[PDB]
């Protein structure tokens, strides 16, 4: 959806709002945008550097910084702060999707 | 039947000889095999499969010939067999002389001949010929000593044929194959006056023989030069005495 | 989904609108199918009669052959195409006022098959038969669409299609349930049609030498129930159908059987008929049916 679509909140439970089907899809797309679009000062990719790291040392973890995401999209950072039980699960899936986009067929490694 | 003392030869058997019928009443549509009868659903592709229950007919083309001495045209049952299968067989006989191998192509069936041609020339070239004749072809998993090899030409082939004989020593001291062996040694980079004249002439002769071999050995019929074109070669300067 | 089914459905609904048979000198040319649709709206009936001759005329009869050879396969596509056509023009009659079932009947087939002419290669195809009515049963309801009550999270699923045999709703009113072991049917949300079985018999003139008479069971589904009295010669038009038979257990010949565990099931059947409609062969009504 839109950035302000997440801002307009209407649900009885905060985690239910996060896991609202349309809202959940919006969260997935917005996280995809945050990871694919955010770039360092010198034009070097932040998430590009992280995926370059992951491709060669083949770890099962990615060191995603909270501050850069916060100045990227405040609503998603606040969703993480209030209800990290659900967004992290989505963020793992979108991270895997982006890794496949850069390095396809990563199932055997991890 | 060739006589050496006369130095001349004549053809005799015409047993399977066929009179060229009226082919029709560019070259891509010359022989994609759509001629005479049968002339002029998507989403399903049998690229990597053979039907379990087969409900279709085979090509019905003449297969007359010999064990070996058979052209790619007839070998793959390619329609509208042309006269140039004969010159292909001629080139096969020619190559049999250059290498001293009489049973040059021991083909117990069509498959043997096709695989032997694949060995000599290459999978890609044979596939290209089949595609030219509107025919799909595929082969994988098989191991070849020359994987799409011998692309240098037939020179390397007759070269290692003679190489193993040289290492063994099959040929006699007076065998005339040794001059050819030296020719390939020199060209592959791998009193005396009469000697130098003689070797110069044999350089030229072997040269022209090897560039008429590749002239005849080409899968394309339309590109394959006719018998008169073969006779017009610079190798055939002895007809010029007329 | 099937591309061919979509093609035949779209062609069906296309010529339900584009078709127009001439009225010769008197009346110019009119849309016969649209005229019948207007008649349907006027009289609020439930069955549409389609001549097979017109379908044969249209598009060199390729579609006619396709629908005659595989009528059963294309029948749902026919229903969907007719529903969309009704939606296009006069969609008021779409609903019962929950949903009104539209019946399609084909009439005037080129040929007539006698009861002894029944063949297995015609199973599922469209044809016509001519016999004498021997036994007629009561008009009984049949489960057009069936609703049930759930086992875990006891609740009622509403308006689920019922096939030729008993069906269990894979989905549940509660999406989290996904349990279907024990369903309890409810008549309120279960649709019904009219069912009646008529045992026809071969006419005398068609009997071969020595053979004793042969007979067939014909099912009349829809408004055509109780349309024929016993002892009358009627022409039945419908689809050739098969029904499971348990009696032919000792007959000669290998019995087809399905193995699945074990999953054994004897695939023994007997031939029957499902007829779209039936045609038989004061002084005012009498005076009307004269030239």
């Amino acid at each position: 959806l839109t950035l302000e679509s997440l801002s307009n909140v209407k649900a009885n439970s905060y985690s239910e709002w996060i896991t609202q089907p349309n809202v959940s899809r919006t969260i997935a797309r917005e996280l995809k945008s945050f990871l694919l679009e955010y770039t360092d000062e010198t034009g070097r990719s932040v998430y590009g550097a992280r995926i370059r790291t992951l491709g060669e040392m083949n770890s099962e973890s990615l060191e995603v910084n909270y501050r850069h995401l916060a100045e990227s999209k405040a609503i998603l950072a606040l969703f993480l702060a209030k209800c990290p039980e659900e967004m992290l699960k989505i963020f793992d899936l979108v991270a895997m999707e982006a890794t496949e986009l850069h390095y396809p067929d990563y199932a055997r490694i991890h | 039947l060739f006589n050496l003392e006369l130095g001349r030869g004549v053809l005799v058997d015409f047993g399977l000889a066929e009179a060229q019928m009226d082919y029709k009443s560019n070259h891509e549509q010359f022989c994609p095999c759509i001629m005479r009868n049968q002339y002029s659903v998507n989403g399903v592709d049998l690229t990597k499969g053979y039907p379990k229950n087969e409900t279709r007919r085979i090509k019905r083309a003449n297969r007359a010939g010999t064990r070996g001495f058979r052209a790619p045209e007839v070998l793959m049952k390619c329609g509208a067999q042309s006269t140039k299968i004969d010159i292909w067989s001629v080139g096969v006989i020619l190559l049999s002389l250059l290498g001293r191998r009489f049973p040059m192509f021991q083909s117990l069936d069509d498959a043997d001949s096709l695989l032997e041609l694949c060995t000599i020339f290459g999978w890609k070239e044979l596939r290209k010929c089949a595609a030219l004749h509107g025919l799909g072809f595929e082969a994988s998993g098989l191991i070849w000593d020359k994987p799409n090899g011998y692309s240098n030409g037939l020179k390397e082939f007759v070269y290692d044929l003679l190489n193993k004989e040289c290492t063994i020593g099959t040929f006699p001291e007076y065998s005339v194959a040794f001059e050819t062996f030296g020719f390939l040694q020199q060209e592959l980079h791998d009193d005396a006056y009469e000697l130098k004249k003689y070797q110069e002439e044999i350089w030229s002769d072997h040269y022209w023989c090897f560039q008429v071999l590749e002239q005849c050995f080409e899968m394309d019929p339309q590109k394959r030069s006719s018998a008169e074109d073969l006779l017009k070669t610079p190798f055939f300067n002895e007809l010029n005495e007329n | 989904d099937d591309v061919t089914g979509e093609k035949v459905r779209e062609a069906f609904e296309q010529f339900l609108e584009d078709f127009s048979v001439q009225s010769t000198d008197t009346g110019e040319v009119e849309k016969v199918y649209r005229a019948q649709i207007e008649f349907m709206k006027i009289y609020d009936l439930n069955t549409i009669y389609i001549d097979y001759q017109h379908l044969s005329m249209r598009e060199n009869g390729a579609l006619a052959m396709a629908i005659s050879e595989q009528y059963y396969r294309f029948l749902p596509f026919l229903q969907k195409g007719l529903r969309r056509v009704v939606r296009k023009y006069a969609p008021e009659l779409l609903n019962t006022s929950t949903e009104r079932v539209f019946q399609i009947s084909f009439f005037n087939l080129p040929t007539v098959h006698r009861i002894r002419d029944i063949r297995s290669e015609k199973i599922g195809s469209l044809l016509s038969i001519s016999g004498t009515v021997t036994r007629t049963s009561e008009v009984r309801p049949e489960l057009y669409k069936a609703s049930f009550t759930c086992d875990m999270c006891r609740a009622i699923v509403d308006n689920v299609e019922q096939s030729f045999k008993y069906t269990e709703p894979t989905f549940c009113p509660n999406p989290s349930c996904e349990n279907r072991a024990f369903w309890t049917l409810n008549v309120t949300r279960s649709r019904f049609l009219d069912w009646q079985k008529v045992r026809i018999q071969e006419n005398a003139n068609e009997i071969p030498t020595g053979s004793m008479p042969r007979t067939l069971d014909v099912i009349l589904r829809g408004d055509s129930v109780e349309r024929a009295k016993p002892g009358d010669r009627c022409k039945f038009t419908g689809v050739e159908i098969v029904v499971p038979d348990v009696t032919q257990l000792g007959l000669p010949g290998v019995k087809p059987s399905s193995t699945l565990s074990l999953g054994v099931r004897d695939l023994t059947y007997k031939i029957s008929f499902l007829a779209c409609h039936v045609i038989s062969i004061d002084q005012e009504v009498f005076l009307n049916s004269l030239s």
């Binding site: 679009e37 | 191998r101 025919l135 030296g182 | -």
Partner: protein, 337 residues
């Protein structure tokens, strides 16, 4: 001439990216239409030759977004489209993408209901799983050779596949290898039950060679650089030296070492019945329980185990006694005289 301007270096340009997100009111079916137009737009530059990247970078000029193509008209803080002005990195809309594609005009793609039906006569109905499995066709698994009609109108000519296990021995590959052998044998066959170094074989070959020395010398004398025989009529020999080993040198080395049917067959059909396929599985050896003139007599259209009995067969004798079969031959026979 803009196409030439836009066919100049983008074949060498290596940076391609396409923006995904946008701020619009889009429905699920509208989402699907967006996805299909997005994949078409991706394919538009997929074959262009310019490599595509998945990340937004200040290097990648190609970036297309539907809305806010420098259309925000205001400062933004966390927008790539806010940086698009400062980085100069080009941006269009998808409608503007089609506007520019009008310069390119790339095709959208690179009915006969009766034909559809009688084609579904083949393959069965087309409503199957779009996968590599149909069970109606033996898909190739092992090393194989396959040659097929391009239009699949005729049956495949050669279709042979071999299990890996039977390929264990290199000597008897079903497809022969270029095992050259020696002594002028077939290049695809070798010295089976033969050894070129076997001293008895060497002696036999040496004796045969020395027997034929004079004949080979006569051949060379007859044929030496004059391109003709009668023209050659009026120096004895020319020997070009070589480092090659021959029969004589190898023989000297060894001596030093030891010093201390018919051709015709009946025409056969192509299609084999399914019952034939079933029968062919149950095949076992014939030893359980119960001269060379064997061939096919096309005159009698019959296959004979023995010729001497076929010639005396009743049908063949009757055929021979009928001159009506040879009338055309006699017509040209008499024309000789």
């Amino acid at each position: 001439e803009w196409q030439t301007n836009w066919k100049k270096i983008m074949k060498r340009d290596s940076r391609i990216y396409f923006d995904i997100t946008d701020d619009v009111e889009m429905n699920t079916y509208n989402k699907s239409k967006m996805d299909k137009r997005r994949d078409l737009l991706k394919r538009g530059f997929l074959t262009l030759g310019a490599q595509i990247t998945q990340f937004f970078d200040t290097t990648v000029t190609i970036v297309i977004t539907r809305r806010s193509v420098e259309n925000i008209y205001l400062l933004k803080d966390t927008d790539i489209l806010s940086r698009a002005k400062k980085n100069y990195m080009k941006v269009w809309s998808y409608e503007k993408a089609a506007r520019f594609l009008k310069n390119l005009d790339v095709d959208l793609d690179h009915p006969t209901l009766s034909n559809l039906l009688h084609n579904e006569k083949l393959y069965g109905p087309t409503d199957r799983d779009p996968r590599t499995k149909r069970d109606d066709i033996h898909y190739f698994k092992y090393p194989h050779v396959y040659l097929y009609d391009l239009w699949q109108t005729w049956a495949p000519i050669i279709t042979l596949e071999w299990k890996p296990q039977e390929l264990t021995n290199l000597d008897e590959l079903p497809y022969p290898i270029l095992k050259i052998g020696s002594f002028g044998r077939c290049p695809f066959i070798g010295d089976r039950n033969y050894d070129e170094s076997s001293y008895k074989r060497v002696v036999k070959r040496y004796s045969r060679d020395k027997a034929n020395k004079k004949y080979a010398l006569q051949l060379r004398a007859l044929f030496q650089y004059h391109a003709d025989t009668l023209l050659n009529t009026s120096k004895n020999l020319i020997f070009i030296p070589h480092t090659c080993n021959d029969s004589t040198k190898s023989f000297k080395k060894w001596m030093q070492e030891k010093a201390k049917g018919n051709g015709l067959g009946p025409t056969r059909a192509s299609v084999m019945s399914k019952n034939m396929k079933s029968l062919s599985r149950l095949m076992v050896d014939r030893k359980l329980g119960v001269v060379k003139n064997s061939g096919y007599c096309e005159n009698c259209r019959v296959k004979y185990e023995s010729l001497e009995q076929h010639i005396v067969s009743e049908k063949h004798l009757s055929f021979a006694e009928n001159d009506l079969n040879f009338e055309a031959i006699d017509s040209l026979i008499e024309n000789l005289r």
